[PDB]
């Protein structure tokens, strides 16, 4: 995901959990050379990423 | 895609010359550049003795 530079890892985890009613294993955040924060969100093993991406709209 | 073999750099020549030096060749007073102490330190000699 792309998030704003004012978000903690805890905030990103909570936002994903509320929005997409899923579980998050961990979060890794970096700040792109162009300015916004990029977040890699690793889900729980019992959730697969492909179906969540389906529900999102990106396939 | 093959990994080419390493170009040969043999040691047969230098090991044959080393065998000659073992026998005592090429070690005359003509073929030596350092001092006697530099070639074989007298302190080390005395230590061993």
């Amino acid at each position: 995901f792309i998030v704003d530079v004012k978000a903690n890892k805890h905030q990103i985890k909570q936002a994903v959990k509320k929005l997409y009613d899923i579980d998050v294993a961990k979060v890794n955040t970096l700040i792109r050379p162009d300015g916004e924060k990029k977040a890699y969100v690793r889900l729980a093993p019992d959730y697969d990423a492909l179906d969540v991406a389906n529900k999102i709209g990106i396939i | 895609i093959i990994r080419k073999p390493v170009t040969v750099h043999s040691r047969a020549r230098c090991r044959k010359n080393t065998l000659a030096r073992r026998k005592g060749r090429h070690m005359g007073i003509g073929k030596r550049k350092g001092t006697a102490n530099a070639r074989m330190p007298e302190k080390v000699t005395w230590m061993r003795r």
Binding site: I31, R32, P33, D34, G35 | -
Partner: protein, 50 residues
């Protein structure tokens, strides 16, 4: 430098974002006098101050 501060990185990001050329639909508006981007900066020529 690999070690850099947050504000330095943000300023660099803004400067990098500013370096794109103009959109092709600009030059054929009506009240337009712009032919190209005249503020483009190359890293070899001008050294960004700092």
């Amino acid at each position: 430098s690999s070690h850099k501060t947050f504000r330095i990185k943000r300023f660099l990001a803004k400067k990098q974002k500013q370096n794109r050329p103009i959109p092709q639909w600009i030059w054929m508006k009506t009240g337009n006098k712009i032919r190209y981007n005249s503020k483009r900066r190359h890293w070899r020529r001008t050294k960004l101050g700092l």
